[PDB]
Amino acid sequence: PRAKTGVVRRRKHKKILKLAKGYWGLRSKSFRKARETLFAAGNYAYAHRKRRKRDFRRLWIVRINAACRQHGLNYSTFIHGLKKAGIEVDRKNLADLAVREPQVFAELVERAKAAQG
Amino acid sequence: AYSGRKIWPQKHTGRARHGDIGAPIFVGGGVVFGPKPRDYSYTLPKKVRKKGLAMAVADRAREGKLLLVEAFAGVNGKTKEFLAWAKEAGLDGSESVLLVTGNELVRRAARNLPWVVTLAPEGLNVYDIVRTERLVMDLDAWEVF
Amino acid sequence: PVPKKKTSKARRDARRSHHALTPPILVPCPECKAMKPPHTVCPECGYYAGRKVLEV
Amino acid sequence: EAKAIARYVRISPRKVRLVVDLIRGKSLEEARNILRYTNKRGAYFVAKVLESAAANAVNNHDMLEDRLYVKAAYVDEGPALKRVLPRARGRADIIKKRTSHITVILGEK
Amino acid sequence: MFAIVKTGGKQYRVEPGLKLRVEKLDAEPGATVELPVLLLGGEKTVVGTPVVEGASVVAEVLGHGRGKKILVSKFKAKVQYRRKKGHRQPYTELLIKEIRG
Amino acid sequence: VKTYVPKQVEPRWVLIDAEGKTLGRLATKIATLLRGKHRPDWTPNVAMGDFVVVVNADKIRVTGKKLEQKIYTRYSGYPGGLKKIPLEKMLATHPERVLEHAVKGMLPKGPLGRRLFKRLKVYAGPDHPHQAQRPEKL
RNA sequence: CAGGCGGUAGGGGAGCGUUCCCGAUGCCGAUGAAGGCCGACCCGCGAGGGCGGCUGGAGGUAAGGGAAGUGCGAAUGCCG
RNA sequence: GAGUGAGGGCGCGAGCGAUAACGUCCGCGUCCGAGCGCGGGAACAACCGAGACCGCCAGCUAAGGCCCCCAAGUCUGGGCU
RNA sequence: CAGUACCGUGAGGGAAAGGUGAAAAGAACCCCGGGAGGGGAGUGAAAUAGAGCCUGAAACCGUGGGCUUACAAGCAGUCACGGCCCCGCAAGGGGUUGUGGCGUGCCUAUUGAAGCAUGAGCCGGCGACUCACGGUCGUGGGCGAGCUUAAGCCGUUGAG
Numbered sequence: 001p002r003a004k005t006g007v008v009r010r011r012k013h014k015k016i017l018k019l020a021k022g023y024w025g026l027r028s029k030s031f032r033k034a035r036e037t038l039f040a041a042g043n044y045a046y047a048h049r050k051r052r053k054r055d056f057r058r059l060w061i062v063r064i065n066a067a068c069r070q071h072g073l074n075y076s077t078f079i080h081g082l083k084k085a086g087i088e089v090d091r092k093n094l095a096d097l098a099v100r101e102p103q104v105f106a107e108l109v110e111r112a113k114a115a116q117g
Numbered sequence: 118a119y120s121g122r123k124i125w126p127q128k129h130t131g132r133a134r135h136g137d138i139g140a141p142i143f144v145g146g147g148v149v150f151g152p153k154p155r156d157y158s159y160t161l162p163k164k165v166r167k168k169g170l171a172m173a174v175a176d177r178a179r180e181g182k183l184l185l186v187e188a189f190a191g192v193n194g195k196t197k198e199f200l201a202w203a204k205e206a207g208l209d210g211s212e213s214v215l216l217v218t219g220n221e222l223v224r225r226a227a228r229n230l231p232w233v234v235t236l237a238p239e240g241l242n243v244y245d246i247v248r249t250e251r252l253v254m255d256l257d258a259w260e261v262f
Numbered sequence: 263p264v265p266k267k268k269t270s271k272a273r274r275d276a277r278r279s280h281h282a283l284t285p286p287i288l289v290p291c292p293e294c295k296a297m298k299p300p301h302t303v304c305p306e307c308g309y310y311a312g313r314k315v316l317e318v
Numbered sequence: 319e320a321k322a323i324a325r326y327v328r329i330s331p332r333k334v335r336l337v338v339d340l341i342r343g344k345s346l347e348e349a350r351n352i353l354r355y356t357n358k359r360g361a362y363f364v365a366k367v368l369e370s371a372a373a374n375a376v377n378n379h380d381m382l383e384d385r386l387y388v389k390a391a392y393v394d395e396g397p398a399l400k401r402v403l404p405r406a407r408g409r410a411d412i413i414k415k416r417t418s419h420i421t422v423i424l425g426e427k
Numbered sequence: 428m429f430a431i432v433k434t435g436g437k438q439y440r441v442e443p444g445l446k447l448r449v450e451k452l453d454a455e456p457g458a459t460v461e462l463p464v465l466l467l468g469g470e471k472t473v474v475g476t477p478v479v480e481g482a483s484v485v486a487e488v489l490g491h492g493r494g495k496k497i498l499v500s501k502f503k504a505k506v507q508y509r510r511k512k513g514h515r516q517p518y519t520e521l522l523i524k525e526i527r528g
Numbered sequence: 529v530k531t532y533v534p535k536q537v538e539p540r541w542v543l544i545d546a547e548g549k550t551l552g553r554l555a556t557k558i559a560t561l562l563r564g565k566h567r568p569d570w571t572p573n574v575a576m577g578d579f580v581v582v583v584n585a586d587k588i589r590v591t592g593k594k595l596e597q598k599i600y601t602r603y604s605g606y607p608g609g610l611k612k613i614p615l616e617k618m619l620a621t622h623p624e625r626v627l628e629h630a631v632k633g634m635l636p637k638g639p640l641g642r643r644l645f646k647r648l649k650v651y652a653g654p655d656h657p658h659q660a661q662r663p664e665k666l
Numbered sequence: 667c668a669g670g671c672g673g674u675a676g677g678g679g680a681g682c683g684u685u686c687c688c689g690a691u692g693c694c695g696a697u698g699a700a701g702g703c704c705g706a707c708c709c710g711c712g713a714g715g716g717c718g719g720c721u722g723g724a725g726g727u728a729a730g731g732g733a734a735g736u737g738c739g740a741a742u743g744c745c746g
Numbered sequence: 747g748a749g750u751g752a753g754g755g756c757g758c759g760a761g762c763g764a765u766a767a768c769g770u771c772c773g774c775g776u777c778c779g780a781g782c783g784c785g786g787g788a789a790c791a792a793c794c795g796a797g798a799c800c801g802c803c804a805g806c807u808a809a810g811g812c813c814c815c816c817a818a819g820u821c822u823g824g825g826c827u
Numbered sequence: 828c829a830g831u832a833c834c835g836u837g838a839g840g841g842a843a844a845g846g847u848g849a850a851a852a853g854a855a856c857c858c859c860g861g862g863a864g865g866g867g868a869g870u871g872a873a874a875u876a877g878a879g880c881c882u883g884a885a886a887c888c889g890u891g892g893g894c895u896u897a898c899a900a901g902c903a904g905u906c907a908c909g910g911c912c913c914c915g916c917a918a919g920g921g922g923u924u925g926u927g928g929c930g931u932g933c934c935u936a937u938u939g940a941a942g943c944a945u946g947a948g949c950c951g952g953c954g955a956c957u958c959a960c961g962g963u964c965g966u967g968g969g970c971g972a973g974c975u976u977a978a979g980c981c982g983u984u985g986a987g
Contacts, residue, residue: 001686001734001735002686003684007701010951029886029950031739036933039505039506043506048904048930049906052905055906055908056908057803066565066570074818076818079818087479087480089433089438096532097469101471107475107477111478121840133742142954143744146744150959238983238987239986268948282336283336285356286355297351321866326864377857390890390891391890395887419888421890450801502711506782506783508934513682514712514799515711532908574908634813
């Protein structure tokens with residue numbers, strides 16, 4: 001019984017080849033190089049997972065504080081205006097009802113606050 | 118290979134280290150022991166050379182064993198005619214079978230036994246029966262007391 | 263002295279764009295059509311000045 | 319349809335390149351002349367080239383001089399011939415010689 | 428007009444009868460008309476009142492028409508030879524169809 | 529999938545300034561005003577905001593005792609020499625120039641920081657030439 | 667259903683990918699084995715496995731498990 | 747059936763040393779190493795918190811924070827800088 | 828057509844280098860023409876079939892295409908809304924990237940790494956504990972106070 005090498009390896013590193021298309025230097029034409037990115041690009045793509053969410057998130061945060069200061073009120077305690085209310089929601093994302101048709105939010109001020117009297 | 122026996126320098130060398138001209142690095146140098154004509158000589162006994170086929174054929178009797186223990190066919194030397202007792206018996210190339218004929222007679226006869234047995238002496242070939250089915254014997258004694 | 267790496271093709275065409283072949287020149291001519299360059303001699307138009315090959 | 323060849327050389331392929339990008343996008347006129355009358359190697363060759371190119375492409379391909387536009391060519395390289403360089407203390411000053419290649423093409427106007 | 432509630436750590440809103448994804452949840456295909464609670468509505472043509480919850484004695488017709496599909500992801504450790512991947516991924520994703528409340 | 533992209537914005541405009549504007553202290557939340565604070569469609573990546581100025585800015589609210597008590601220095605030397613100048617100096621050298629600095633200290637940065645800055649008219653008018661609006665807020 | 671889950675060496679569970687065996691006077695196979703370029707569907711957590719297209723030019727080995735000069739980025743390694 | 751003593755940072759008891767060193771010997775505690783994956787730490791494994799597969803345009807709080815370059819009152823005082 | 832080229836002084840030492848096709852049928856002829864090396868045609872099942880011709884990948888090659896770019900700072904990739912050319916009625920699927928965010932790699936050593944502490948030409952391709960025998964704990968087993976025969980001899984295509 002005899003056994004050698006052949007084609008195995010190339011394939012295992014060819015996977016990379018495909019995932020590497022579009023990269024710059026050797027990261028677009030190398031098995032050990034692109035490999036070494038599956039690490040950066042890889043971990044940073046995934047990892048950039050908490051990143052990507054962490055982004056769209058706080059993004060909401062301000063635009064929010066932004067014009068809420070228009071009607072007057074402001075974050076922190078503002079959120080309270082919700083608690084003293086009766087429940088708590090809006091996923092500050094939905095809080096987009098300021099992006100299109102915000103007077104909707106207007107009342108919301110009248111809301112929250114009013115709990116303090 | 119009785120190599121050039123020792124060669125290159127050291128310290129410096131072709132950058133790459135070395136001393137032993139055995140260079141088990143190329144497709145022609147030393148390596149390891151993969152094979153070894155020692156195909157290893159392991160085995161067992163007859164205290165099993167028995168029990169095995171016992172239970173096997175029993176269920177292979179639920180298949181359709183039988184075995185005249187000794188049957189004719191004709192010229193016992195002309196292939197065709199032998200089979201003539203294949204049909205006049207009930208067999209035809211499909212579900213496979215085998216048999217033990219301790220006589221050169223049907224041996225120097227059965228010639229090319231595809232799908233079939235054509236034995237005579239004694240060696241035992243259960244396996245090939247696996248890919249087959251029915252069969253016949255030469256006296257219980259021939260099998261072995 | 264001595265380096266220790268491998269050349270980059272990027273810088274390849276980079277510093278070599280100024281190699282964009284700067285083609286020569288040429289002009290018309292008299293008699294036949296020996297459109298000669300700024301001061302030369304050719305039997306395609308010959309000429310009519312000193313005397314070289316042929317003209318018509 | 320207005321074509322030839324440019325392979326089996328004896329020298330530097332990169333030295334040709336721009337020699338072509340020099341006369342690319344032009345017309346039969348343009349190239350044939352200008353360069354033909356432009357020193358520094360290349361010339362004496364690219365020449366015989368265009369002559370056979372459209373000579374048949376206007377033969378067993380029937381074209382038309384004057385209108386044959388200068389498509390372009392294929393800046394590319396070829397094979398080599400080995401020879402080492404002696405030196406101080408019989409060292410490793412080694413090499414060979416890159417020949418050249420590329421393609422020939424114009425069209426019907 | 429719009430409307431709003433949620434679906435397990437994921438608050439959503441809509442309009443008429445659209446639908447795309449949000450993992451999977453029991454109840455055979457889209458042969459049912461399932462619906463949970465809510466909280467506000469949509470200060471516009473018809474409303475202007477949220478308050479304490481609101482999902483009090485009020486739900487929302489969330490049609491079905493299932494189409495659950497198996498997606499994909501792709502993972503791997505990656506650090507210093509401690510990249511022990513050998514493990515991509517998928518994840519759930521149901522396809523149905525809303526209505527309203 | 530809520531986005532927020534309104535498809536552009538086209539920043540605003542406004543005006544202000546006087547001998548009673550606390551230089552720098554103001555700065556901070558100043559730029560934090562341009563980029564696009566009141567701009568809801570505000571998608572941090574895009575560069576909206578406004579377009580504002582500060583006239584009779586020369587000497588504006590002289591802040592406090594920063595005068596002589598601050599050396600606006602960031603110009604690094606080459607052979608062994610850069611720059612200095614304290615308050616009773618810059619306050620002079622282009623008052624407009626001045627104020628610029630005070631903020632310049634912190635400021636933002638990047639292709640974005642750059643742009644949202646373009647529109648930074650100041651000085652000591654009043655009256656902001658090449659204007660085309662200015663809803664001044666006191 | 668509580669629980670467990672980072673985790674170098676080490677020490678378990680499998681599985682996977684990788685060349686001869688019978689099966690091979692069984693079976694695909696030139697409306698293609700085999701190489702491949704491509705695949706942005708399906709199956710695989712992965713191992714991979716597919717799975718079908720176009721170039722491709724003569725064979726392959728089923729389920730199964732029975733044998734293992736491989737499961738090789740590299741060592742200024744051998745070589746081209 | 748395998749690692750194994752070439753550990754060290756911190757802190758404390760304590761001997762060294764010119765309360766000399768991100769040092770030495772131990773003890774021990776420690777966590778890094780082996781947790782160079784979190785976070786703070788301005789950037790910096792060993793100092794505080796906090797110990798890890800999905801999806802997240804999900805929420806609550808501890809370390810730890812609310813003018814700027816990025817998050818949340820230039821809050822309230824009430825003084826004292 | 829190697830123990831040759833070759834390197835040696837002796838001894839010595841040692842290379843590379845198989846593959847058109849069923850059949851050479853091996854290129855007729857005529858315009859480029861320095862012979863060279865071209866185009867047609869023909870044979871030709873097949874010239875991405877013709878002589879470093881089998882099939883022909885890979886490092887290294889631009890024709891030529893498409894997406895990018897001259898205020899600009901970076902292990903570079905990523906994740907994000909956006910825009911910017913193929914394909915899907917639609918759903919979208921795309922390719923690229925702007926900026927914004929985000930980003931200390933990789934293989935070997937150790938209280939201690941990313942690190943100018945080593946190695947890393949570059950791609951391919953070759954590469955490393957079986958196995959003999961021998962010792963010795965487990966595992967499906969059978970026999971089981973009982974439980975196991977070498978070296979031969981007939982015989983074995985084979986097997987026995």
